[PDB]
Symmetry: D2
């Protein structure tokens, strides 16, 4: 659409596309921050809409906003939440550090749309006003941090934690299914004392269970909302009940335990809750990296690696059977590296507040919500396209066990340490199995070896 509409702010008039719902301040940000391609994610836009919806409801309860306007703002916000206005939010992450410009983007879009819903028009003849109505009782300084925490807490509760629980359940099923399959241990990459495949997988399960607890511990701080601190944390120019009322309303409409931040100065001056919560996410990334690496190394082959397990083959040469890459493991290890880098960017932004306001906020939330998407969707993908189909290669597992030198300790009680060690040394030096070396020395019979060397007795319970 080439045709324009003239929108105004305190700086003057500026042309906006006639087919868009934003206003003058959005247009100025769009034109002045042509930096790369990263924009606010949908989760954050939705959290801003939820914040405005709750603010309008409380302003109406307090007699500060008319019922007609409050209902129109709620309806407009619900359209945003329903996915009807994604193209109305064009602003970059790399904008003002308070996120003021995205606050104004929501104020302008909701005001112009609410005006239409009341039978009016968009633009300067609108019946609902971005600052006086949609931003009533609020500051950018308290709205943007509120939307950050709303988006973060809902993403953790609704996407990440459920996918973590699902992957954990799958691996727990596999651990139980493979509880009796003895395999060679590996420490330092070297052959080691045996354990069952179920025991090894139980370590992955325990890692994921511990990670869930650490993530859960980070949620109460993210649930604290800045809204009501206004410009600098004092709440000047707001009703004394606004802060608690809006947190309560957000809790009602999201079914999440939002509360007003007990100290609004900490809430405005820092991103500390997200620095801490992201600490738990980088812990999960380190655990997932290890699990993903174990899976791809154990599946490596078809003939010149380890090959103890098989995994689903999801992408396609017919001349090369068994030559499909562990692509889910690769995607997962890549995104785990991304989370580690994202943690550094978050830490730098979080360490860089000054006085009453941290102004590194768009960058912090860009990284935080990205890590949540990566970890949630990555666990979902790895689970459905790899973990549910892990299977042992029982003959290969047994071949490696039986060709190893590690089972020699089963001989000690029968023939003594000295002869057992002589057998292991001969097998290693001459390239023999333990059985072949033991028979060559005449220290036992084949029936004795088969009776005495029992891997299923070497793994505890």
């Amino acid at each position: 659409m080439n045709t324009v509409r003239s929108e105004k702010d305190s700086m003057g008039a500026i042309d906006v596309p006639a087919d868009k719902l934003w206003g003058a301040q959005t247009q100025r940000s769009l034109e002045h921050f042509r930096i790369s391609t990263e924009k606010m994610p949908t989760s954050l836009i939705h959290a801003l809409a939820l914040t405005k919806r709750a603010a309008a409801k409380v302003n109406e309860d307090l007699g500060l906003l008319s019922e007609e306007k409050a209902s129109a703002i709620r309806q407009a916000a619900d359209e945003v939440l329903a996915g009807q206005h994604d193209d109305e939010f064009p602003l970059a992450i790399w904008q003002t550090g308070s996120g003021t410009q995205s606050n104004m983007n929501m104020n302008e879009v909701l005001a112009n749309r609410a005006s239409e819903l009341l039978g009016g028009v968009r633009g300067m003849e609108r019946k609902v006003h971005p600052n006086d109505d949609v931003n009533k009782s609020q500051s950018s300084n308290d709205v943007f941090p509120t939307a950050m925490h709303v988006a973060a807490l809902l993403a953790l509760r609704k996407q990440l934690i459920p996918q973590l629980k699902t992957l954990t359940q799958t691996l727990n099923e596999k651990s139980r299914a493979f509880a009796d399959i003895v395999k060679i241990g590996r420490t330092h990459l070297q052959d080691a004392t045996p354990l069952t495949l179920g025991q090894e997988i139980s370590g992955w399960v325990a890692m994921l269970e511990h990670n869930l607890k650490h993530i859960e511990y980070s949620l109460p701080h993210v649930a604290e909302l800045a809204l009501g601190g206004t410009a600098v944390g004092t709440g000047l120019n707001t009703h004394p009940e606004y802060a608690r009322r809006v947190a309560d309303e957000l809790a009602v409409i999201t079914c999440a335990p939002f509360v007003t931040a007990p100290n609004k100065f900490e809430a405005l001056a820092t991103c500390d809750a997200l620095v801490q919560a992201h600490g738990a996410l980088k812990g999960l990334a380190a655990s997932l990296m290890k699990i993903a690496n174990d899976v791809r190394w154990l599946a490596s082959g078809p003939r010149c690696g380890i090959g103890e397990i098989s995994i689903p083959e999801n992408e396609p040469s017919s001349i090369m059977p068994g030559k499909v890459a562990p692509t889910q493991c690769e995607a997962l290890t890549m995104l785990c590296c991304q989370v580690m880098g994202n943690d550094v960017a978050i830490n730098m932004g979080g360490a860089s507040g000054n006085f009453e306001l941290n102004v590194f906020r768009p960058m912090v939330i860009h990284n935080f919500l990205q890590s949540v998407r990566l970890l949630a969707d990555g666990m979902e993908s790895f689970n459905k396209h790899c973990a549910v189909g892990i299977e042992p290669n029982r003959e290969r597992i047994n071949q490696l066990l039986n060709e190893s030198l590690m089972l020699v300790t089963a001989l000690n009680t029968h023939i003594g340490y000295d002869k057992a060690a002589e057998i292991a040394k001969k097998a290693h030096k001459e390239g023999l199995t333990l059985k072949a070396a033991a028979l060559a020395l005449g220290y036992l019979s084949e029936a004795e070896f088969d009776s005495w060397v029992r891997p299923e007795q070497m793994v505890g319970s």
Copy 2:
């Protein structure tokens, strides 16, 4: 478009949207890696198209590909380069770690489109074939690293370096314009020996000049291309002249000094050139962070900060004059934090190669090209919306100078160290200017103070 077309690969048939040009392998990747929202950037898609265009030209020179097909592939690639097919590349960053799936995305789109250009159709009756024709003489293992370096070198040469030079020129102009404006120094955040505003800005200029050299030093390694190493680096199944010929052709069509990598094993097994080049970019981020912080602190006010300079005010309360935030400085400091995090993700991916292939490649190039966009566009934005308009506040600069205790050293040659120190101590203890303290003690006249205390004599040349 709901209607589908059945596309085939060695795994079988899969439905693709009838209005799209990709094929079976793209569709499988699209469906199996539903991870977050990050896709290949346009610069990388273009670099893949350039690589296929050059490969087709050389295959034709060598008699391996018909003129009719080579010209059709070139035409299709030129359509990609002209921006006609951006929606034909739907794949995620978080895919197979070799980038094979994006290689196949380009093979399939170019084959289906080249078929149409020859009077044929898209799909399984096509006249041009993704693997046999578009991927002739190539492997994913050597194509994706080639596209990574093509995209990286062109982005550095065409976007980042020109914007760096432009910002450097602007600050050099400002340094010359303000060469005679003496201001208070600040070390440890404390008042310090004076220097000129031009001298202070000359430090910013020298930083940017040094950064340009460091970036230039990283370009020769990025210019080395893997293409011709094929699956593992040996060049098996390729003409002995292919590697040099394709690097030469890429050099011709891009006007950049691409060369074939002297060691294809290093070229496939690592991302070392990009790890090193990104080291120079994180150096630039640290320099830009410092410059941006100096600008916003020096402009801080209007009345309770430093206020030595003014900057353009680009976004809008009429009740609050002088209360506009340094928003370009905020966007720039935020993206500098991002580059630091991106460096960690790149380092982890680059450290994580195994044997013949590094399979962290989509993640590495995602971060690398993002840092280039951020630094290039950030310098462009900061220059045009802030740096070109920096101005001194001469009265405020002089007020701070004259109210400081630092000019007292100008008295030493006239009245001696002991009396000068007595004056400074009295001024500090009693809250006086140096002049008022000196007159109160009777150690000089006002005319003597004005004649002797000359800041323009205290900054060298």
Copy 3:
């Protein structure tokens, strides 16, 4: 001047005046990398682990009373600082910490032998592997020592110093609760708040950090000891794991428990990756607090200057008030260090393979360094800076009353447009708000003094 000690590789000369043995001596010849060694906290945690292992082995009838008691006595000597020069090995050693495990086994065996009337060296009465390492593997001993050192350092150094600094700042916040000052957002002048309110933000940050650190302690309290080589506990008494964790809890008075999954305990450093996440959070908070302090104290004349801080370093007599905020500088530097240490830890923690993580010396080197830096940094910042923060009341009032920010107090009495006109005139002509208001004739001096009350603008 030397004696000959032996292991399975043969004989090797060891300094006669040292208590280590053949394996420690070999490590000194093969891992000559940089200067970083095991810190005292880790050496002590290793000695505690061996003391507890010896006690449990005695309880189970696996180790004689005379040997177990002599091992415990030698371990107590290490804990008492008598053997600091007996642990010469680099951080940059075998990734399981085997070499440092053997260093402790050899030193304790040679010393225990002397306590039993014997000698050090190959004629010793107590043996590094058969006695001091009985029921153990390096694979489970080293992560046990890591967690013992980490939990005790958090409980005994970091958490007390965090509480002490928090209490100081809470006292300052109360003392300054009624001092109104200009706010600053985006570095620009902003709506007022009290100095006490601003400091209460620092206090709330430190209180939140304490909770996050406390949440990390239960996982660190889980011990690998008893998992043996790969986690199955093969060749170990079924009660060993619980008994040794119980004994460590007794002797340290800390709530150590045996890890419920020994495979997670051996294959990862996850508890420390998570606990260090809380420490880098504290580093980000301390960076912000330290920066606020040095910026608010900046001057003496050309910065902000709203607070004064103690001056701990000399300066030239001709430069009064120039002294640098050096406690803030040391603190901001160590906060950067913690951020880098977190990356090193994350890479090590992400890099386990199969049954064992072999990045352990590096992980614990970084973790214990971060604890020392944060604990000692908070102690130093508290004692030498925070306890002495004071307001510069005249400067605070000068900045507040000469700013443009108090103009909002006029909106309810005169027009918002009149108030805006006052602010624009003051800014344009370099006037105070009061002077611009009197020049426009919009109010009396009595009206301005009655209407513009900063103390009514901080709620």
Copy 4:
């Protein structure tokens, strides 16, 4: 047992048997943070800086010959290792390095006084500020010492060890140029290459890293000395900056030059941020090389096992061949450390304000540690692992000939579909390619031996 030394803050007791003075003693009371101190390389670089400054001051007629010579003699004693215990200050000090500058000024003044027949303490004949610090500021001395230490460590330790390891691996690549082995991509079996070709990739990585490190040296060679307090050189002789850089170049034999812009030199650590970028590149390359070595050596029976490496540690006699790849573990651990150190350096380097960066002790602590780790790590990996890499020729051949990858050699003789059918049958039925081909009757044993030549598949 003590003497009383004085500064502008008053008198303070200093140990009689030490050579520092009042300001160093105060730092010891105010910066009791952790255990990290200035490394020897930095102490030596500080002594060299003072030696050069004294020589130039003498040349310019600003310092007497007897004092300048005594200062140079005392500095030479520091360089000769006679005063290591005279530098007790923490890294975590004033961010400009002022305290360590004063530590050197006091030690050199007190010792120079003794060399002139005087005493240490307040009756000294040579003075820390007026003599040893003449023409200097802490602001320009500390970054000069940082760059002197960094450039000399890169030239004398890191670059020689990098060249030595590269030469070893180049010899191995030539020795193994004809040993065909299976390729591995995505961890999966892949097209063959020679062991020599695979090692040539490691060699090319190290050669590229050397070039990147060399490109960082010119900026590190630029020295701040002569910029004085804020970069203007106020109160300093106009020739001082060039003369002191020249003298440092003479005495160190390294190409030091004066920084062309002293404001960049004082306000940033940019040269070290950039140089450390090349070091983290080397860390990423060494991580990959070390991982290839330990994976290729993995076994003795249940891994890859294509190469053998020296066994430097003992093991139990019942566990032959189990020894861990411990050099690879130390090297991968220190590579993680370098990555973390880079983050700490980047944060410090990004955090300058106005005329001075005050994150300097932390930046140089990390930078010099990374140099020690990489230099010593490359020395250790070379001597104790790389020189002893050998192929396991039978295992290499077993993996290669039992894989499915050589089937492509049949495409030109029989059908591609026949070759594909052979591979599918071998994979399905657990056969070799040759056995599956003979079972299908698609060729003779002579034809397979003639056609399937791995040595013709590596070009």
